[PDB]
Amino acid sequence: AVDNINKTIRDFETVPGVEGAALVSADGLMISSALPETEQERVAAISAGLLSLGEKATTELDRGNFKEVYVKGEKGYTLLTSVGENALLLVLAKADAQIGLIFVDMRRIADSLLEIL
Amino acid sequence: VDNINKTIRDFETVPGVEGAALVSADGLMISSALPETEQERVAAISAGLLSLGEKATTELDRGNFKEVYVKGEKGYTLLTSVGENALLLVLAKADAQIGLIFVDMRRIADSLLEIL
């Protein structure tokens, strides 16, 4: 269960444009990452912050149970998909990444990690 | 002011578009066709989506805020910057084509910026 989760998350970083991928709990704690060892505690805290305010969007405007959220800035994308209850998958990319298809890969791998986790 | 209004009734025609609104960055509604009871509330909710969208785009070094996407199982909330001091919110159905509606918003967001 643990060998197969680590390798699945790092393989995202073999797509053109993808910098990092972290599997984080809903409550802000790091499960499995390949990001720099320094930033791993502060990125897991921000991830859970983005999950909670995506929840607000969907509840408050009558849109159904939360699925996905992405933010585009000047320099790059932040991309987040729910892993059933209690977990979530983060991808960072730059402006030249092919966002619609990463969400299709993210959706399939979420349900894969959901069985073995 | 007549050329800002019906310009927001026209997105509804496109398939998958439940509702549009022009809102201020402080949370006061400018132009919308939504139920005239909800409009004050919906102006408040789009307020936070921008700020809490500016907080990921300032904490993870992604540059200036441009756009925010959320998706729920019964549909989508989309928001784009209408320059400084306003924003365009679009409620869509969970079977609409997002990549095009963004192409239609980001142009209109710079065709309302010069007359507003």
Residue numbers in the entry:
A (entry chain A): 4 to 120
B (entry chain D): 5 to 120
Paper excerpt:
Both proteins displayed approximately similar levels of homology with the RB proteins M. xanthus MglB and H. Sapiens LAMTOR2, matching ~110 residues with an RMSD of 1.5–1.6 Å. These homologies indicate that the RB fold is highly conserved between all domains of life and that the profilin and longin domains share a core structure with RB. Despite the similarity in structures, Thor-RB and MKD1-RB display different surface charge distributions. Thus, we hypothesize that MKD1-RB may be a membrane-interacting module, whereas Thor-RB, which lacks the basic patch, may be a scaffold protein for protein:protein interactions.
Here, we take a structural approach to assess the relatedness of these eukaryotic-like proteins in Asgard archaea, the closest known prokaryotic relatives to eukaryotes. Asgard archaea roadblock, longin and TRAPPC3 domain-containing proteins form dimers similar to those found in the eukaryotic TRAPP and Ragulator complexes. We conclude that the emergence of these protein architectures predated eukaryogenesis, however further adaptations occurred in proto-eukaryotes to allow these proteins to regulate distinct internal membranes.
